[PDB]
Amino acid sequence: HKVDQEFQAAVSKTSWNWLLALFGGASSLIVVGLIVLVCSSMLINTRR
Amino acid sequence: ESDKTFPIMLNGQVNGYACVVGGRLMKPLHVEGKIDNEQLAAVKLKKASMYDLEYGDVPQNMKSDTLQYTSDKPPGFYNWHHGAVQYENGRFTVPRGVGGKGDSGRPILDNRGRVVAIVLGGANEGTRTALSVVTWNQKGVTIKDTPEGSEPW
Amino acid sequence: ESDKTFPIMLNGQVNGYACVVGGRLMKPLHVEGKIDNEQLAAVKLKKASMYDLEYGDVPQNMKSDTLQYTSDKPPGFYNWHHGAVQYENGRFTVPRGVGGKGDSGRPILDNRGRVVAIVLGGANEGTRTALSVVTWNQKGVTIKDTPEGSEPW
């Protein structure tokens, strides 16, 4: 084998897209949860 | 007030009061004890920790006979188990000396028999004592009004 | 109430009451029986099952002499066959032990001799009895008020 096999450029863009979608779902979900908590707290403070 | 307000027991001593308003029973969180009523002991309480309160759905045979709520609060004198409380400048105050530990959760009544606020604590300014309570609003918002230096009773 | 309120029979037993309001006859669905009046026996009763009711168009002769509905509901006391019924907090109740099965469809009367609601059922709650009924509204909207534990009379 004339070229070494790395980790970054060793998985197809289909697998990369599926993995990134599955992880970004959780990341965006926790971000949305934090945003929702902040918005609820701000609404409570404003309408207090 | 005497009939529909119950004592909370802590090793056999009074330490608070649980109030039934509009078919729901509220009790301060900071006061720890067992409700004297046997029926209310089986009522599940869901807690607003940031409001220092827990509320629950009362059983079927006491919800109508309850302290009817109200939202209109003109300044002046209002009823209280220990006497009269002055609502002025959007603040509830009492003469300095009356009230203390174990009076948390005491309902404040209206002249017509309705509830205006529930006492949680008090802070002494020297001249009077400003009561940290929960007050209601026209838009149906319950603000926990706590003057600076408030100590929960 | 006596003149313009017809019981529904079944095997010689009264099990409800039918009411002619606003020029149209109304009858509740949970009760089964035979309408007393012969002239109204020929009305095809269009059913609102989710409203637990059927309504029909009364003939020409009797549309002039009917009970009148109302939209404004000043809180307080209202007339009824079994005395005064109490209205607060968007809710109707009666002193306990008053009313029972077979009283469904009996209108609630006000001071000026007009209908404000139609009794459908009740829940006995010890201190009082909460009446599960149908009521009107400002925008011409018919709304049910059926408290928890309601039983169709």
User: What sign does the dihedral C18-C146-B39-C88 (CA atoms) show?
Assistant: negative
Partners of residue C93 in chain B, C-beta under 8 Å: 64
Which is nearest to C105 in space by CA: C12, C31, C11, C3?
A: C31
d(CA B85, CA B99): 11
In total, chain C counts a number of residues equal to: 153
**Is-contact C54 C8, C-beta < 8 A?**
no
The answer to whether residue C30 is catalytic is: yes
d(CA C137, CA B152): 44
Whether residue C109 lies within 8 A of chain B, CB to CB, comes out as: no
Q: Inter-chain contact B61–C88, Cβ cutoff 8 Å?
A: no
Query: What contacts B120, CB < 8 A, 6 or more positions away?
Result: B28, B30, B52, B104, B105, B131, B132, B133, B134, B144, B146, B152, B153
Which one from B49, B52, B103, B150 is the annotated catalytic residue? Answer: B52
Query: What contacts A46, CB < 8 A, 6 or more positions away?
Result: none
Query: What contacts B62, CB < 8 A, 6 or more positions away?
Result: B20, B39, C126, C127
3-state secondary structure at position A22: helix
3-state secondary structure at position C146: coil
> Obtained via which technique?
cryo-EM
d(CA A34, CA A22): 19
Neighbours of chain C (3+ CB pairs under 8 A): B
Tokens of C16: 């409800």
Chain A CA closest to residue B136: A48
d(CA A23, CA B36): 53
Tokens of C26: 């109304």
Chain B CA closest to residue C150: B60
- Position B148: which residue type? E
**Is-contact B130 B123, C-beta < 8 A?**
yes
Tokens of C106: 């009996």
Is A29 exposed, middle or buried (CB count within 10 Å of its CB: 0-12, 13-18, 19+)? exposed
Kind of pairing between the strands at B53-57 and B76-80: unpaired
The answer to whether residue C82 is catalytic is: no
The answer to whether residue C49 is catalytic is: no
**Is-contact C46 C55, C-beta < 8 A?**
yes
Whether residue A47 lies within 8 A of chain B, CB to CB, comes out as: yes
Q: Which ranges of chain B does DSSP label H, i.e. alpha helix?
A: 38-41
For the CA atoms of A40, A41, A42, A48, the dihedral, rounded to the nearest 10 degrees, stands at: 100
